[PDB]
Ligand binder design. Structure first.
Ligand SMILES: CCCCCCCCCCCCCCCCCC(=O)OC[C@H](CO)OC(=O)CCCCCCCCCCCCCCCCC
Ligand SMILES: CCCCCCCCCCCCCCCCCC(=O)OC[C@H](CO)OC(=O)CCCCCCCCCCCCCCCCC
Ligand SMILES: CCCCCCCCCCCCCCCCCC(=O)OC[C@H](CO)OC(=O)CCCCCCCCCCCCCCCCC
Ligand SMILES: CCCCCCCCCCCCCCCCCC(=O)OC[C@H](CO)OC(=O)CCCCCCCCCCCCCCCCC
Ligand SMILES: CCCCCCCCCO
Ligand SMILES: CCCCCCCCCO
Ligand SMILES: CCCCCCCCCO
Ligand SMILES: CCCCCCCCCO
Ligand SMILES: [K+]
Ligand SMILES: [K+]
Ligand SMILES: [K+]
Ligand SMILES: [K+]
Ligand SMILES: [K+]
Ligand SMILES: [K+]
Lengths: 102, 105, 102, 102, 102, 105
């Protein structure tokens, strides 16, 4: 399989990001339940929270208050930012190669 | 923690009328309220989830409404099998809590 | 039309982003009305919401509470992030070509 | 002046961004005063608001409620995102040239 | 030490970012205490605040209200954005070199 | 600033019962409340931190609960050494403040 590395890694980052979103949702709820006042405690809204966290939006409607909930959050942020950054890098590599040919 | 207040504790109504149970939270909880029915010596049974969403198997005369702090469970045309205790429950913040309950007469 | 690919795609992303902002505004209101407590329910502020969502700002003044409103939100985020990322990639390609000549 | 284009443009974007932050602060206050409930109405906190807006942070402590305040906000977001994106593009061009030599 | 410049700088940015997060946490608390109503006043949550600030998430649960707290915030934002931007630039340089070989 | 109200100022209880001290904040402070015990002519001593977290050296009969604005310090089976003044303290917003205190009888 000799397809462009930048597109492979971009695909890998996307799949991995989806995994992080699902795992993040699960682990956040597991971490936040048991803490009085915590709102990140049911899976559907936890997945929504993971999405806005990975994109860095966030709104402030949901967020973790525990140590482990916040650690999970940081992993989600980094994975999200890295993934989108890897797509941008792949796009640049594409454009650069095509401009040489042009 | 979130306090849910059900007042009055007893509702008396003539057979066929529309009845409304009241549930008030000590803070805003969106639509994260669920309703349960418990008959004499029975286990609780889910009637309405997320304030207004209906459950399969539950008679259409049961409905729910409200958002924020004030929630209502309604029965259109009360009949004999509706005689029971009615509880609300919030899932907005940990821990989940229950209301004190309203008895139907 | 043989103008640089990176500038064409950047232009395309911009036009597409504007379309997403308008469609997102429309679909969010359509999705959020019917849900008690929802604030994303009139078009002018929905477009404002779409903008901060596409830029990842978010403020928290407005956000969707429904499943379909949140799905629309995710599309807006991704389209926004991808579009700005495509501009950055185009800028890099420009700078790289110009530094070779320099 | 034949210094690298990517560093010139990056510098230009920085200076322009500072101008946008100052002008944005001024124009936001001018736009938001007269609207009941508006909080973006004194210059010092307006500049703070402009900063978190240009960086896409957002906190939600301050935001515009008027049409023209929101338009000013969008300009600040775009200028901020473009500026940081231009820096990243400049960094890439630097690294690419240095890796060829290495 | 002749390892790729883009990976060295990326590593340096990461280490520096960690330093900024720790120093930012310390300086924010030092700045915010003494201001009535300030919430950014204990170190553990201050570090959490620094993280979401550096990633531009943000939630709005915590933010500075003082001049010096806000200045510290801006440094954290810029350091965060620059660091992630430097990683993306490094990723692009990697992909570009590998696509030439491919 | 944040006002913490401890009412009543005096709790009288029979030896062996469960007692509950009340602490109410003028605004939401999450779980940022801490409890202290001060005996006659003694210095204050930390009993519970962050509303519910226990401290080493403190008898297991001491517990804490609550979040938002309403907080409770509880003693399971009160004994003679528990006779003292009890204070709550918030660290949510500057400046830190103290409650007025509740005496145990
Ligand atoms: C990486 C980001 C993780 C930080 C989360 C902060 C803990 C929040 C919490 O709810 O933690 C909960 C828990 C409170 O009981 O906090 C704790 O003790 C957890 C102990 C570790 C906290 C970090 C240490 C603070 C370092 C500040 C810099 C000091 C030198 C300057
Ligand atoms: C992509 C982001 C979309 C997630 C939006 C969450 C639904 C919010 C809602 O208001 O949904 C409304 C609706 C509630 O009636 O939620 C629902 O049931 C919708 C059903 C789908 C919800 C996602 C499933 C949760 C997956 C969690 C991981 C479990 C394994 C770990
Ligand atoms: C670019 C982002 C600017 C949108 C700001 C929204 C106006 C907010 C406001 O406070 O505006 C204030 C003012 C209210 O008096 O709003 C108005 O009328 C302003 C008129 C223009 C508003 C935009 C039109 C809505 C387009 C929605 C899509 C419809 C087709 C789908
Ligand atoms: C870089 C971002 C730092 C701005 C923080 C604003 C001060 C917030 C504050 O809590 O500051 C606190 C302090 C209030 O006592 O504010 C002050 O005076 C501080 C003096 C400096 C404030 C900046 C000057 C405003 C410039 C607006 C543009 C005017 C021309 C258009
Ligand atoms: C890094 C993710 C770990 C999740 C751990 C859950 C926390 C357990 C609560 O005591
Ligand atoms: C992906 C956008 C679809 C918008 C659908 C609106 C939701 C209908 C509400 O029942
Ligand atoms: C694009 C910036 C224009 C600022 C205009 C201020 C709005 C005047 C309020 O009627
Ligand atoms: C740039 C960081 C400086 C931190 C200074 C603390 C502010 C002192 C409060 O008077
Ligand atoms: K944000
Ligand atoms: K926010
Ligand atoms: K952001
Ligand atoms: K935000
Ligand atoms: K907010
Ligand atoms: K970015």
């Amino acid at each position: 399989h000799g397809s462009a590395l930048h597109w492979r890694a971009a695909g890998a980052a996307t799949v991995l990001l989806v995994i992080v979103l699902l795992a993040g949702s699960y682990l956040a709820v597991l971490a936040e339940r048991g803490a009085p006042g915590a709102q990140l405690i049911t899976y559907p809204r936890a997945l929504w929270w993971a999405c806005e966290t990975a994109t860095t939006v966030x709104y402030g409607d949901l967020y973790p208050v525990t140590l482990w909930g916040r650690l999970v959050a940081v992993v989600v942020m980094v994975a999200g930012i890295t993934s989108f950054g890897l797509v941008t890098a792949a796009l640049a590599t594409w454009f650069v190669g095509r401009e040489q040919e042009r | 923690d979130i306090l849910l207040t059900q007042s009055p504790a007893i509702l008396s109504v003539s057979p066929g009328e529309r009845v409304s149970f009241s549930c008030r939270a000590s803070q805003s909880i969106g639509t994260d309220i669920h309703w349960y029915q418990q008959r004499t010596n029975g286990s609780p049974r889910l009637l309405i989830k997320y304030a207004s969403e209906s459950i399969s198997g539950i008679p259409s005369r049961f409905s729910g409404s409200g958002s924020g702090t004030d929630f209502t469970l309604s029965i259109n045309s009360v009949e004999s099998e509706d005689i029971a205790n009615y509880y609300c429950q919030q899932s907005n913040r940990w821990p989940f809590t229950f209301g004190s309950g309203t008895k139907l007469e």
